[PDB]
């Protein structure tokens, strides 16, 4: 009850700016998301032991991958606990309680392979889920930890507040999609140029709430350059990966995963910022204006990239 988690004096601080790095300590990234916990939702938001044990479960089903592992979780977790603190007013409770915990859950059992790639490979869960093949995957796998003995960190909900919560972290999940994203954003932008934009509007919530999901998931390009670099190495390190087996049944894959073509890798990533990650950091900053350093320091890694094709780095 009267147990907070603290922070050294660097971390507390800086854990505050969307631009903080979790570190390479595995060890303290539990006490990092418990913490964001109790100062984005309360100290009774959740019973510690229940959430503990959740976290921990939550972990285990994390594979050992380059990119969409237990990091990935824990830091798409922090840029939710940055947005969400610098709207305070804007969120409900159970908005608060469902996405960071839809955040720490998003990508579990990511085996480091697109949707398309199970689809073309005819893995199981494709036939299972024919569109956003692994996210209703990750949402299964939420369900599966929260319904573990002893791992209900809902339980103190009531039922239709329970149904809302799971569905808040169910839609957040589904739309860390990217083919959703394009579509998503572009429905947005009208909403916001035309005025029709209202809060109020469960449907509108969900839509604001799916590009926050995006521009969380996408928090890589929003880091110092030093960060953003050396993540992007884990990024490719994936996708060359699922070339490599696109490769293995007969398909030469898109360039992006060819690692025969590094060469265009500058580009691939003027094409990513400029069609996907600015556009998502400018519709967010327009709807939640205290969200305007994630474009800027998206604004800085485009130019950083820029510089490499010119050959200054
Ligand atoms: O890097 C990402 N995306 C992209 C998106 C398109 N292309 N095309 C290329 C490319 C094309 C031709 C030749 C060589 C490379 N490289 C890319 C990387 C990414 C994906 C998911 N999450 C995050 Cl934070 C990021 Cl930063
Ligand atoms: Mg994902
Ligand atoms: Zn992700």
């Known amino acids: 009850g009267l147990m ?31 913490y964001m916990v109790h100062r984005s939702c309360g100290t009774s938001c959740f019973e510690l032991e229940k959430l503990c044990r959740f976290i921990m479960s939550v972990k285990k089903n994390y594979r050992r991958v380059p990119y969409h592992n237990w990091k990935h979780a824990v830091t798409v977790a922090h840029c939710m606990y940055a947005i969400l ?19 720490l859950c998003h990508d579990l059992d990511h085996r480091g392979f697109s949707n398309s790639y199970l689809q073309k490979f005819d893995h199981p869960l494709a036939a299972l889920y024919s569109t956003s093949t692994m996210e209703q995957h990750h949402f299964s796998q939420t369900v599966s930890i929260l319904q573990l003995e002893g ?36 429905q947005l932008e009208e909403m916001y140029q035309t005025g029709s934009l209202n809060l109020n509007n469960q449907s509108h919530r969900d839509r604001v709430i799916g590009l926050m999901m995006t521009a969380c998931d996408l928090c890589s390009v929003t880091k110092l350059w030093p960060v953003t670099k050396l993540t992007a190495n884990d990024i490719y390190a994936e996708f060359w990966a699922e070339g490599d087996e696109m490769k293995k049944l007969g ?35 327009q709807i939640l204006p205290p969200t305007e350093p994630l474009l800027k320091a998206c604004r800085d890694n485009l130019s950083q990239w820029e510089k490499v094709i010119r050959g200054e780095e």
Request: glycine share 4%.
């Open 85 to 103: 603190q610098n709207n305070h007013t804007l969120f409900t409770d159970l908005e608060r309680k469902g996405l960071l915990i839809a955040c």
């Open 251 to 285: 398909i030469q894959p898109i360039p992006m995963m060819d690692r025969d073509k590094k060469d265009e890798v500058p580009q691939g990533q003027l094409g990513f910022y400029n069609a996907v990650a600015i556009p998502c950091y400018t519709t967010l900053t």
């Open 151 to 186: 791992h209900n960190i809902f339980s103190t909900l009531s039922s239709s507040e329970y149904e809302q919560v799971l569905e808040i972290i169910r839609k957040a999940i589904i739309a860390t999609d990217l083919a959703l994203y394009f579509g998503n954003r572009k």
């Open 4 to 34: 907070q988690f603290t922070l050294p004096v660097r971390l507390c601080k800086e854990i505050e700016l969307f631009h903080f790095d979790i570190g390479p300590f595995e060890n303290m990234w539990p006490g990092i998301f418990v």
